[PDB]
Design a protein around this nucleic acid. Structure first.
Ligand SMILES: [Mg+2]
Ligand SMILES: [Mg+2]
Ligand SMILES: [Mg+2]
Ligand SMILES: [Mg+2]
Ligand SMILES: [Mg+2]
Ligand SMILES: [Mg+2]
Lengths: 136, 217, 213
RNA sequence: CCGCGGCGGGUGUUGACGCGAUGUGAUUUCUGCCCAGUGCUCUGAAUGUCAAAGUGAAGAAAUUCAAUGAAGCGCGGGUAA
RNA sequence: CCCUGUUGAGCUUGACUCUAGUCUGGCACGGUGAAGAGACAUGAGAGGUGUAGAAUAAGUGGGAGGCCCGGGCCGCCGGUGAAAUACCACUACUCUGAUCGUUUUUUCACUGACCCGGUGAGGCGGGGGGGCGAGCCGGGCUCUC
RNA sequence: GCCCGGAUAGCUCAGCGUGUAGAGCAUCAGACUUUUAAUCUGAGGGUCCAGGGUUCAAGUCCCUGUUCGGGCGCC
């Protein structure tokens, strides 16, 4: 765990990846390439109930751990890449987003740029489900 | 766990290990004990290890005996400083009193004669078979000649399930020339009370109150 | 049973020398431990950098990409790799009751890179217009993408890679097509939406260094 | 697949639209349920049993006793043109 | 045909006793270099819940006052349980790690034994000159050429 | 002969040295305007047989009564 920088002169950047499904939520903090990672923790490691794998409190219990594991290594600022499930399936980011971003911004980081990287296809294949569709 | 003057692994001669006056870390009198480790002698087996050895040097414990008996030992030893008593002392010492400030207890050595063998294992059995005051045939209870020895520096020892022996041998207050007549009789009779197997004497200690061992040869 | 993050070194990454800011950030690499080389596993890394954190006061809805090519020691040197348009902008620009126009063309510069360029153009609602549609024709579309194919090649066939960047930091092409297509039908929302490099030349070492002074 | 044998020999001057080993019997039409059994195969330290060798101790030694222990059978999944 | 013989042949399998071939281990011909996985031995640190009881008294054999400064905190008797905790240890259990040995270890590595293919055994590796052309601060030549 | 595991209420069946669990049958009630299905109490337990040692055994050891694996073989 090393740092060559000075504090107020500049802000050392990293970048996160906020995956947000309807049943699970990733946070994956990597570097500017994305090739080199720093830490990764899921929602599922912390709550022993699979019906709230993606409760909003289950993202806060892992985002606090990420900003706790990263302050020992010297990162002040982060970029954000937000990302739904994408594809031919849905495209609405679930509820585990707006309380995990505030959950680490409140936990003392320097938020940079915000964008969307949801994989929107130009021309989809066929979604799983019949012509009358999943009825229940 | 330590004792600064004497090291435990150096093996001093039988008089050089009487350097024990430098063990005085305590003002009072240490209970000098022994923790010998028998090897190749399974406590599971029918091979018994429970016996007596009379020492010499009056190691100054306090002794309280409740001899039980119904014999001509009532007219043989009632001048020899023991509270000997008849079956009224069995009705007495039966453990009806598990109560405040008085128990049917506080006697370091009991007795079973041949006439009261169908009593002390009957009446006081579950109350005296676990503290150790239960008489038997390997605890050496006839006590017409040996009760003065159970006054003296005689000691008793038996086997333990974690492969050791613990017995009291002296007190660090006495002189070295009496601790040598504690060393002679201490190292003499464990070979004869130990039977033919892998080597007998392996891990001999001297012990005290807040103390550490010191090994001899 | 060992933390592997002390087995790393942080490096820096630079930019070419037609921009303002040189530094981008820090990127950790393992040490050269036996066979694997810290220059090698670092050289093929791509940096997605927005242009408003490369300039002082320009727009922020344009992004560049910069690969690494050469190791100087705590110093990676970068080259142009392509340009992106933000999903904020493009989806905030496509709206109903206007006509969309796209185009794409390939071009080789004077030293050779095989750039592929895309574009887009939206028609503009007039001032006093009460007719709701404001659609274009189809012959006026084909007579528009003929000009965009004429211009991207014309601005590219006769210069190198260093000066088309200075023709892409402003919106100098979208200005030109907006003012050479205002005659037919008035469009307002013109961009070149993606520039992609296909086939890079031989690794000549100090054309970059010329791009670093 | 041959052969007493070797860097031996056929298939093979061949290469999966190819060699080799099987059951049914044209076309049209259909080909059902069962993997407990006997076979076959796959995960095997997920382990009960398991030689020679190499190892330790007691003995004057020949010996005697202990740890460890490959495949395969056992245990667990797949398979009925 | 049918029966008997202590007479035989051809075939079959869960008959009895054996065998070519094939699978696996060991010793050899059989070398040169580094890393990693153990079998623990000496010896180190950690924990324990039917409560009762000064606690979680795992089990020791005693001890009847020290400890720490004539003074203060605790009995073994109580308080109360199956054994009592003031009083030191040894002995187990498993966890973890350094340790030297131990040792059975597996992947990566070189080429010289050995094995394979190809040829009428026909231009191999270094180093030069010549070339695309160059950090061009032209030059020592740089990845291909 | 060698080693090895297995037996608990009327059927299948849990048991973590300090206590006999469970699901399904048989009753009686409750819920529903009334039948179905679900809800709950209750009745049934010698922990396959004798001993051990332990304060305390269904539990570790021991053997005998019952089912089964495997490798072995000179009267
Ligand atoms: Mg067939
Ligand atoms: Mg079958
Ligand atoms: Mg005959
Ligand atoms: Mg015959
Ligand atoms: Mg047969
Ligand atoms: Mg009723």
């Amino acid at each position: 765990s090393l740092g060559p920088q000075v504090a107020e002169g500049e802000n050392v950047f990293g970048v996160c990846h906020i995956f947000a499904s309807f049943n699970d939520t990733f946070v994956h903090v990597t570097d500017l390439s994305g090739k080199e990672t720093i830490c990764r923790v899921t929602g599922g490691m912390k709550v022993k109930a699979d019906r709230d794998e993606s409760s909003p409190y289950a993202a806060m219990l892992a985002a606090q751990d990420v900003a706790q594991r990263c302050k020992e290594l010297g990162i002040t600022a982060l970029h954000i890449k937000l990302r739904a499930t994408g594809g031919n399936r849905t495209k609405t980011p679930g509820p585990g987003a707006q309380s995990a971003l505030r959950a680490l911004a409140r936990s003392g980081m320097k938020i940079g740029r915000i964008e969307d990287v949801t994989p929107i296809p130009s021309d989809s294949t066929r979604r799983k489900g019949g012509r009358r569709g999943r009825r229940l | 766990m330590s004792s600064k003057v004497s090291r435990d692994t150096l093996y001093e001669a039988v008089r050089e290990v009487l350097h024990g006056n430098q063990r005085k870390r305590r003002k009072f009198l240490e209970t000098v004990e022994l923790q010998i480790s028998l090897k190749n002698y399974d406590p599971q087996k029918d091979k018994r290890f429970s016996g007596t050895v009379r020492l010499k040097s009056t190691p100054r414990p306090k002794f309280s005996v409740c001899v039980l008996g119904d014999q001509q030992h009532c007219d043989e030893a009632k001048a020899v400083d023991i509270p000997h008593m008849d079956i009224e002392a069995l009705k007495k010492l039966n453990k009806n009193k598990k109560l405040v400030k008085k128990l049917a207890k506080k006697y370091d050595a009991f007795l079973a004669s041949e006439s009261l063998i169908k009593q002390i294992p009957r009446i006081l059995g579950p109350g005296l078979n676990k503290a150790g005051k239960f008489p038997s045939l390997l605890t050496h209870n006839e006590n017409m000649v040996a009760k003065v020895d159970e006054v003296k520096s005689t000691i008793k020892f038996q086997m333990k399930k974690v492969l050791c022996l613990a017995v009291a041998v002296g007190h660090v207050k006495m002189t070295d020339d009496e601790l040598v007549y504690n060393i002679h009789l201490a190292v003499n009779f464990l070979v004869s009370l130990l039977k033919k197997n892998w080597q007998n004497v392996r891990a001999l200690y001297i012990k005290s109150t807040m103390g550490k061992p010191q090994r001899l040869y | 049973v060992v933390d592997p993050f002390s087995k790393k070194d942080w490096y820096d990454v630079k930019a070419p020398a037609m921009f303002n800011i040189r530094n981008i950030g820090k990127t950790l690499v393992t040490r050269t431990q036996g066979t694997k080389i810290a220059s090698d596993g670092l050289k093929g890394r791509v940096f997605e950098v927005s242009l408003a954190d490369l300039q002082n006061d320009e727009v922020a809805f344009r992004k560049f990409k910069l690969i690494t090519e050469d190791v100087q020691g705590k110093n990676c040197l970068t080259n142009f790799h392509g340009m992106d348009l933000t999903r904020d902008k493009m989806c905030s620009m496509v709206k109903k009751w206007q006509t969309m126009i796209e185009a794409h063309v390939d071009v080789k510069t004077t030293d050779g890179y095989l750039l592929r360029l895309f574009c887009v153009g939206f028609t503009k609602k007039r001032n006093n217009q009460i007719r709701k549609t404001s659609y274009a024709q189809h012959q006026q579309v084909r007579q528009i993408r003929k000009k965009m194919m004429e211009i991207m090649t014309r601005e590219v066939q006769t210069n190198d890679l260093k000066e088309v960047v200075n023709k892409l930091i402003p919106d100098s092409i979208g200005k030109d097509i907006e003012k050479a297509c205002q005659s037919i039908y008035p469009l307002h929302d013109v961009f070149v939406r993606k520039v992609k490099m296909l086939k890079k030349p031989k690794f000549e070492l100090g054309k970059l260094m010329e791009l670093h002074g």
